[PDB]
Design a protein around this ligand. Structure first.
Ligand SMILES: Oc1ccc2c(c1)CC[C@H](c1ccccc1)[C@@H]2c1ccc(OCCN2CCCC2)cc1
Ligand SMILES: Oc1ccc2c(c1)CC[C@H](c1ccccc1)[C@@H]2c1ccc(OCCN2CCCC2)cc1
Lengths: 235, 235
C-alpha cells in the first residue's frame, strides 16, 4: 500500500472513482426529498470507493467507520463541486438535476452559495481530475484523524499509518504538478492553495450537518452501526 | 507587503504577536467557568484586531473585507493561540497563565467535547514539533483564508481584493517553505510538512464551528461579535 509509486497511486484513485448517479423522479408530469434520496444512494458507492483508497482497508473496521463518519458529507460535497465546475452558477447534483441558487430557496440557499463559490474557485485554479481524486482521498483520511480519542498502542499505529498514507498523497500531488511542468515554487504554492480549500469544505459540511440534525429525523445522519454494517463486508 | 523577503515576513509576524493575557478573577477567593473564558476572549479580541492590522497585506484590503475576514476567523484565531500556548502542557489547556485547565474542569459549563478537540490539536502540534515561526505563519493564513471563499461579491473591487489575498497567501506559503529549508529539511520533507501543517487548519475550522454553535445557542445579545462592532474596532 505504502510501496505504490506516484503514478500507481493516481491510477488506483482514478480506477476507484464512484459512478455519477441520477436523481430519482418521474421526468414526465420535494427538493430535500430528491437530494436526500440521491445522497443515500451515493453513500453506498462511497463505501466501495473508500475501501479502494490505498491504505484505507489496512485500518481497523472501527477506524474506517470513524473516518467515514467524519468525512462523508465533505466527500459528497467535493464530488458535487467537481461535477459542477463546468456549469457556472449552477450545481450539478445529478445530470438530470442541475440547479441554480434560486432553486435552492425552497428550503438551503446559504449552502448552495458556498458550494457555488467552491466550484468557481476550482474553475479559477483549473483543477485537474487527478488532483481532485487526491484531494478527495485526503478528506477521507484527514477529517477524522484528530478525533480518535484513543491512545491505545493500536491507535498510535493507526494514526501513524494514516499520516504515512497522507504523506504519499502529498508526494503524488507534487508529482502531478511536476509532470505538468510547474516550477518548484508554483508546486508548493498550488499544493497550499488546494489544501486550503479543504478547510472551506469542512466549513460547508458543518453547516450542512447542522441542517440534517435540525430535521430531527431518525435516519438523516448515518449511524455508526449503519456505517459499520456497510463497511463490515463478508467475503 | 508583496515585496517582503521571507525573513522580513517572519520578522513582521513575530513582532506583530499579541500578548498573553491573564484571566480576571480574585485568586484569593474560592474557585463562572464560561464567564471567565468569555471575559478572557473579549479582551483578547481587542488585541487580535491590532495584530490583524500588522499582518502584511491585511490593511491593504477594504475596511469591509477586513471585517469579513475577522468575522470568519476570530474564533479559529483564539483557538490556535490557545493550542499553541498549551503545547508544552500535555493534557491541559493554558487559557491563561493563571488558568490552566484539564478536561475534567471542562465538564462544568457541552464543553468537554470542545476541550478534547483542542487538547488533541495541541498533542498534534507537540508531535510535529511545531515552531514559533511556523505558528505565526499558520495564524496569518487562517486570518486570510477563512473568509475568502464567502465574499459573495464579484464587483471589480472584490475581484482585486480576492486576487490580493491569494497573492499574500502565496507569499506566506513561500515563507513556510523557506523556514523549513532553513531548518535543513529535504524538498520532500518540506512539501510533506507544509501539507501536514495546512491539513491541521481544517480541524481548527471544525473546532471553531463547534464552538460557534455553542455561543449561538446561548441566545445572548453580544456573544457573537457583530459586523458593526468589528467595524468600530477596525474603524
Ligand atoms: O451529491 C450530493 C447529493 C446531495 C447533497 C449534496 C451532494 C451536497 C449537500 C446537500 C445538502 C443540502 C441541504 C442540506 C444539507 C446538505 C445535499 C444533501 C442532502 C441530504 C443529505 O443527507 C441525507 C441523509 N442521508 C441520510 C444518510 C446519509 C445521508 C446529504 C447531502
Ligand atoms: O484564548 C481563548 C479564550 C477563550 C476560549 C478559547 C481561547 C477557545 C474556545 C473557548 C470556548 C469554550 C466554550 C465554547 C466556545 C468556545 C473559549 C471561548 C469562550 C467564549 C468565547 O466567546 C465569548 C464572546 N465574546 C463575545 C465577543 C467575542 C467573544 C470565545 C472563546
Amino acid at each position: 500500500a505504502l510501496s505504490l509509486t506516484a503514478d500507481q497511486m493516481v491510477s488506483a484513485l482514478l480506477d476507484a472513482e464512484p459512478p455519477i448517479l441520477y436523481s430519482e423522479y418521474d421526468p414526465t408530469r420535494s427538493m430535500m426529498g430528491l437530494l436526500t434520496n440521491l445522497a443515500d444512494r451515493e453513500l453506498v458507492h462511497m463505501i466501495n470507493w473508500a475501501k479502494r483508497v490505498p491504505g484505507f482497508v489496512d485500518l481497523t473496521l472501527h477506524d474506517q467507520v470513524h473516518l467515514l463518519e467524519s468525512a462523508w458529507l465533505e466527500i459528497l460535497m467535493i464530488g458535487l463541486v467537481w461535477r459542477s465546475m463546468e456549469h457556472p452558477g449552477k450545481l450539478l447534483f445529478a445530470p438530470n438535476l442541475l440547479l441554480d441558487r434560486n432553486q435552492g430557496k425552497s428550503v438551503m440557499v446559504e449552502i448552495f452559495d458556498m458550494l457555488l463559490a467552491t466550484s468557481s474557485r476550482f474553475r479559477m485554479m483549473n483543477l485537474q481530475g487527478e488532483e481532485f481524486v487526491c484531494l478527495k482521498s485526503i478528506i477521507l483520511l484527514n477529517s477524522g484523524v484528530y478525533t480518535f480519542l484513543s491512545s491505545t498502542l493500536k491507535s498510535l499505529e493507526e494514526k501513524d499509518h494514516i499520516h504515512r498514507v497522507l504523506d504519499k498523497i502529498t508526494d503524488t500531488l507534487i508529482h502531478l504538478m511536476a509532470k505538468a511542468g510547474l516550477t518548484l515554487q508554483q508546486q508548493h504554492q498550488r499544493l497550499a492553495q488546494l489544501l486550503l480549500i479543504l478547510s472551506h469544505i469542512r466549513h460547508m459540511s458543518n453547516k450542512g450537518m447542522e441542517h440534517l440534525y435540525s430535521m430531527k429525523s431518525k435516519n438523516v445522519v448515518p449511524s455508526y452501526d449503519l456505517l459499520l454494517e456497510m463497511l463490515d463486508a463478508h467475503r
